[PDB]
Design a protein that fits this description.
homodimer, alpha/beta, five-stranded mixed beta sheet, 2 helices
Amino acid sequence: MRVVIQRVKGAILSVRELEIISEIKNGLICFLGIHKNDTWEDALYIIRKCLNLRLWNNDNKTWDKNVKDLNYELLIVSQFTLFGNTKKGNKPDFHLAKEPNEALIFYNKIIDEFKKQYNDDKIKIGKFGNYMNIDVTNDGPVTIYIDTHDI
Amino acid sequence: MRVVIQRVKGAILSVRELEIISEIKNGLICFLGIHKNDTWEDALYIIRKCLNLRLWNNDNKTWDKNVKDLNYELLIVSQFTLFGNTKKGNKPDFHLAKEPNEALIFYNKIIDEFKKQYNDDKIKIGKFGNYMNIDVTNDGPVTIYIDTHDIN
């Protein structure tokens, strides 16, 4: 699995004449893309990490607190495009990304495990594989990147 | 070098209460992490992809037009946390990113190539080294990741 983590002050997910469905205040927006061979082990990591990366400060310390510590929230958002190879031409192709059907069920297992670890009022999501418009407010910005296969 | 790229319908970057200092409207937002041992050859691989990746849909075709083909801007930002390291413990390890001054000047060096390769007026930066505050109208969304050390 791949994730782009971005520290934020809010975010307003919206879908098409354009309407809002999700909004976090402080916390993380996670651009998470499943790979055609991710196992629950993979996700299990991405969750652990998203939920525990101490990415905030807590006066006189840096990178000291994490999403949960400060009761913040996560907005998890499926991103097939993270596997989009760009090495080939100047056009990408997202064949690496898991088949976009079972993937959905993986995703829901994710969001589901996410809530079983944090509380479940803190986990927000978009509309799987639907054009979305997201007003993120980047705080920093902090932008962390994990690739579970790297490990 | 590593770069998160995001298709945007706009971006508003500010610094220090806050002061807007940059703003695009349709284009890309690139989060560039400069690596300790980045050769200029690496910097050219980003700019070519940023400038030439066909991330825009048009006329019954997907993934077709690159940022230039549309005359769109590109808001560029030094992002060093991209070299954060979270394999060991939960407190990232930034010990692999080029260092600030030799990163700054590298940054500028990369901003310019952009400029030479497209147009001055289409390219904004932030404020290297300063806490910033960027509002980003993600469009899709569409995030692409590139790592120069991963290639030939």
